[PDB]
Amino acid sequence: RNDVILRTTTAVVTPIIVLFSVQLFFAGHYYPGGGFIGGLMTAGAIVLLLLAFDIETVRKMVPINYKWLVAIGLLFAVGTGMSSMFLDRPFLTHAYKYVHLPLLDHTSLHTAVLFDLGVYFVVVGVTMIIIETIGESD
Amino acid sequence: MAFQILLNVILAFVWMFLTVSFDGASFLVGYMIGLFILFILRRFFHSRFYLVPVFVIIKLLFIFFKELILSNIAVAKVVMQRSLTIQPAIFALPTELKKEWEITVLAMLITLTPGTLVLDVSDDGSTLYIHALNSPDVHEAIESIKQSFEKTIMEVSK
Amino acid sequence: MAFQILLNVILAFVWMFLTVSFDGASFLVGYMIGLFILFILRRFFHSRFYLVPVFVIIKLLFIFFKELILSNIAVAKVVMQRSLTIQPAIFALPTELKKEWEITVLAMLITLTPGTLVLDVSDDGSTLYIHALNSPDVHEAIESIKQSFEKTIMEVSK
Amino acid sequence: MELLMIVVIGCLFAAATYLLLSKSLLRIIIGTGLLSHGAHLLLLTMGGLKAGAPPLLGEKASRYVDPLPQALILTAIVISFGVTAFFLVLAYRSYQEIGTDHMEGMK
Amino acid sequence: MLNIALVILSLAMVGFLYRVVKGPSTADRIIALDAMGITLAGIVAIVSMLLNTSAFLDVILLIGILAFVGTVAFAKFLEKGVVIERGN
Amino acid sequence: IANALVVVLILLGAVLTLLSAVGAIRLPDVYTRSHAISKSTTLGIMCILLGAFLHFFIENNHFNSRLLLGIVFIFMTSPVAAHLISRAAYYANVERWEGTVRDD
Amino acid sequence: SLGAVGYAVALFFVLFRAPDLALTQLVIETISVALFLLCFYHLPKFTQKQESVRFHLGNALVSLAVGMTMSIIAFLAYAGKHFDSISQYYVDNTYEKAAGKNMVNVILVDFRGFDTLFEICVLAIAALGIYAMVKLRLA
Amino acid sequence: MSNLLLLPIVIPLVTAIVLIFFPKHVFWQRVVSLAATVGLVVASGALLHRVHTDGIQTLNVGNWPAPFGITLVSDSLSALLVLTTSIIALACLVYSFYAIGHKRETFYYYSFFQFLIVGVNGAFTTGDLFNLFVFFEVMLMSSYVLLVLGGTKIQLRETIKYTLVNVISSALFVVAVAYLYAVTGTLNMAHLADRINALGSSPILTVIAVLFIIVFGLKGAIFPLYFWLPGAYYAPPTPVLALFGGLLTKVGVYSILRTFTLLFTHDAAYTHTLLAWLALGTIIIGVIGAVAYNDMRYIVIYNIIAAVGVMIFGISIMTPESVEGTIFYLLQDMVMKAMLFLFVGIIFSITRSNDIRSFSGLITSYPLLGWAFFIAALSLAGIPPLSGFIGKLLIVKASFDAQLIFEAIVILLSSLLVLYSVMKIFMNGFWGEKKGFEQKQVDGRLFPVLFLLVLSVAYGIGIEFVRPFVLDAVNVLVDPSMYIEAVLK
Ligand SMILES: [K+]
Ligand SMILES: [K+]
């Protein structure tokens, strides 16, 4: 009952789903897409990995628990609002921000994208919590 | 076969670093020079000078497109025909192919062939069952076609 | 180990093609995305997730530079010393290294080690003779050093 | 065109209401789904359906479709999906522990 | 023109719907739903050519990936119970 | 729209999808329908997407790579879908329309 | 059929010029139909019997009254007197004041982003509640 | 600075998020939730002093102007409701420390608590209808999970019932927002209030106002929309039930209040006579159910229904004395119903039974609890040194001043019947000889109930302290011109 064809087409189909979800996420402010559909299809790529494999194997391949993901994404959205609050502005004012981690020095981005990033992480986490909670119930 | 391609890419990097200009034209010039240099040094590598796998995977892409068009013309002349004429079959075929990548590209090629459809690759990687749409029409000629297909798949992997 | 690097490069190409901008910044973005994707798909490959060979060849480069400096400090304190003190030796060492590339990088590392010089790697790929400059000083400690060196060479190639 | 959308959301409302008033629980959740579809189509219809470009400023058209009702619908869609997934897992739990589907028999 | 292709795809979707209504086994209904989704992707492509907008191609690749994931899920369901196995 | 190739690609993909539908109706077994549906609607949808790709590439000068990745994805994924449904039907001890010489 | 209703509502969203709604609608209907099929195949095999929808006359009268009532309120509301809208500001200041060309997403995260935070909260509560219902079995 | 208005919303929210990380560490769950609830009470008191000193507090969320972004508005009534919510939440949280077992609070209990108080606190301060929708679903989703958590058969069944009803009412609020957007074109309270007052002679506004009555009366149980509430509140455990009875039905009452004092003012005669008859039916249903049952939880449930009916009848008169009376009665009734559910929980803990006919003689073993329940019963009825007197006094006076004799007599007889129900509990349970129970020392959980009782007694004594807040609340409710010139600057 070897699923060699299913596993190999999963291995070559999962990267284009992941690139498609990341491209949906990054192009949200200018074209259709956003954190919602990008998070749902990142979860769909992990769903395809769940369909090709076990439930312990996929958490071995992707070593995340998703409850911390939904908590940290909620933290990103609220912290974007708080960083808006401190500088004599109302909550979620959304000015620009430089990130030099150092990665690609002084990357100037609009802070609505980190709000979208919180949306992204909570959508991925919620969908995966639902699916792998139902899966191992028995 | 990928190590030679990576080695040609990094020799193009060394050529771009040997001058002080960084541009795609210098990358193509350095890639051509590295192609000549790897042609000189074919003895040390083990698999193959890397252009032959590139040309035969281009051959497999063209075989995919051509067998797709031929398969849909065959289905076109089966469906618009009076539909009492077909004769089904399910048959086995032995296999010499070992890795699961060549087995699935053989299966994906032979699915898209006119008159055939895969079901039950065996548990052992030793036989493949397949559903023929027309039994007396394509059962030995298309077996020669799939022998040529798996011959080309064998000579991809040397 | 090179197939994964080539696969990351062509996934960065697919990322640059998925948008309509062609620039090195988008290439680095696509390379990071492909690094994450190949970290997801580590199960299908056979050797190793490819960052560990990159870090250990950086480790071998640093070992080359450090053993070069230590070797020249050792020769500095041998030559300016009154030259009646050294004790020569030639000795064998067994070898588990199979391919000639790891054998020659072992030989090029252990030549450049303080107090050693290679002559007569055997016809069989099983033992290596070596000329020690100081016999009682470095004959078992430097043997532990070369055991650590060939251990690092073994964990380069998994 | 709004008249046709009104006379089809009315049929969605009538169907949802008829499935909610039934004896089995899965029919009730199907009616919940149809009621959600009717409400979301009603938001889109009452926002207006006059022809213009999709809400994207790259397309430089003279007039655009209204951007507000689409955002309100997308909010309502994700909220309705959360409640629907919860209520489906709840129905699964009640099938597992109680052992019946009859809604009138639930006492 | 484009309206002719929409009529032809609409009648094709009606044909796949006739196969999803009847057909004794479940597998006929599954393949009919798969082809019906792919035909829906074609309808979205042609109506995007009609509306003269490039704003719906993500819908097309989305319909493709959703159809593949749903069909492999239900094909796993017909084979020996679960769609998601338990850990060893 | 003004191109002969674009129009003939769109109409050929549409007609070939309708051929997939009448093959879904008329063929007697699950496996023959797998043949017809798989190959014919795969090539039909790729012809339609190539036509739409060429239309937006010509009369708008906009290179849309999402259509090309859709074509590659559908080509990769619809025959393996037909393979999985056909293996799922065969393992369910389902056989129709006068089985010939067939082995297990 | 509920699935077909969902995918055709997505096709309405395509046809009424709403791309984001179509994308999210397609994915959410596929997940929800998978959850309905989860809920179907674990029905208890006793007292199941697969029986049709029982016809009661009062249910049909109430349902037709509900549908025609909300239809006629929608027609009366849509076709009366009116003030126009406030979306000229959003099509005039999505790019001049915010950083965006999309307008559904800029409304969702910048102009009215205060209520997107709490739908994220609703999804979080839903996932945590599903986990809590499945795992906690004190009885 | 000006973000003080968000501190009732932001403080529990953050808290709920950081309670997700450590489920198995119940001690730190208790410590963090307790400290954050105390900070919530302090921040709500600071907000109430802020809205008392200078005017009504309006905050645009972005830097966007008043029609076009989300605006949060805190007037004096919303600040009073936030402070009352904070006090009830603190008392229910300490009762939750003593009452909820270990297994239920390893599984995210305090997170769901904090999300419920997020939902109610966000619902009392908002200036948009659709944002109010979103806060209703935050509140309702957390209430679904708090109702079902634990997973016995009873709370499974009535979670199915409660969830079904609230899904239907959520869809109805969606279609009401859709109709009103098609008529007006805006979504914030103040600007659509201005637009409705610019075309106030249209019948469709009356139809949509009646639809909002139906939605918000599905939220807070009015006749004939009450039918979900007895079984749904018979299901949950005791501090969850105290949260539900204190908070959930009273935000529908506030939404009716804001709707008919802000939005729909033209053609007032039809809407107010509809509210009057629905309120009379609600009072009659509540007192019939309170008389009928010999079960403690059902008695307190139908007292919730009766008090909601009295508040709606106070809303149905557009006089400032009736509005003042229903604000006083609203605050004390939130506090009092939370108190009475905590009493019922302590008595059930002692007796291992909920039937009044099963046990007697609790004064001889639990005197402090007995006389505390006696004072709680007399304060529920409306005896003048206690809390709920001045509210129904002003309601009765405003109904007599508008020539409604029969309805005022209905209010007074309802007060009599609710007194009879709670004193039936006291006289059959506490008095008599000892037969029903076994001596068991209670501990700890009696003290939040005593804290609520002391605050209710001090509320009844000190009306002159707590009145000028209610006077500014009345001055902004019967004049929405100050509301719409505060927001639309
Ligand atoms: K809805
Ligand atoms: K919908």
Numbering used by the authors:
A (entry chain B): 3 to 140
B (entry chain E), C (entry chain e): 1 to 158
D (entry chain C): 1 to 107
E (entry chain F): 2 to 89
F (entry chain G): 8 to 111
G (entry chain A): 678 to 816
H (entry chain D): 1 to 489
Q: What's written in the study?
A:
The largest two Mrp subunits, MrpA and MrpD, are homologous to each other, have 14 conserved trans-membrane (TM) helices, and are thought to participate in proton translocation.
Therefore we purified the complex in a milder detergent Lauryl Maltose Neopentyl Glycol (LMNG) and collected a dataset again at 35° tilt. The best dimer class refined to 3.7 Å resolution, while the best pseudo-monomer (after symmetry expansion) class refined to 3.0 Å with excellent density in all areas including previously disordered edges. The thinness of the dimer interface is mainly due to the two very short N-terminal TMHs of MrpE, of only about 15 residues each, which form the bulk of the interface, resulting in only ~20 Å total protein span across the membrane. A very thin hydrophobic belt is clearly unfavourable for membrane protein folding and so it must have a functional role in Mrp, most likely by acting to significantly disturb and thin a lipid membrane in this area. Our cryo-EM maps revealed strong cation density (stronger than waters) both in DDM and LMNG samples. On the basis of these considerations and according to the analysis of cavities and tunnels by MOLE we propose that the Na+ pathway (which applies also to K+) starts near H42g/H131e, passes by the highly conserved D35f, traverses the large Na+ cavity between MrpF and MrpAC, passes by the key E706a and enters the double cavity where at least two cations, as we observe, can be coordinated between E706a, H37c, H40c and E137d.
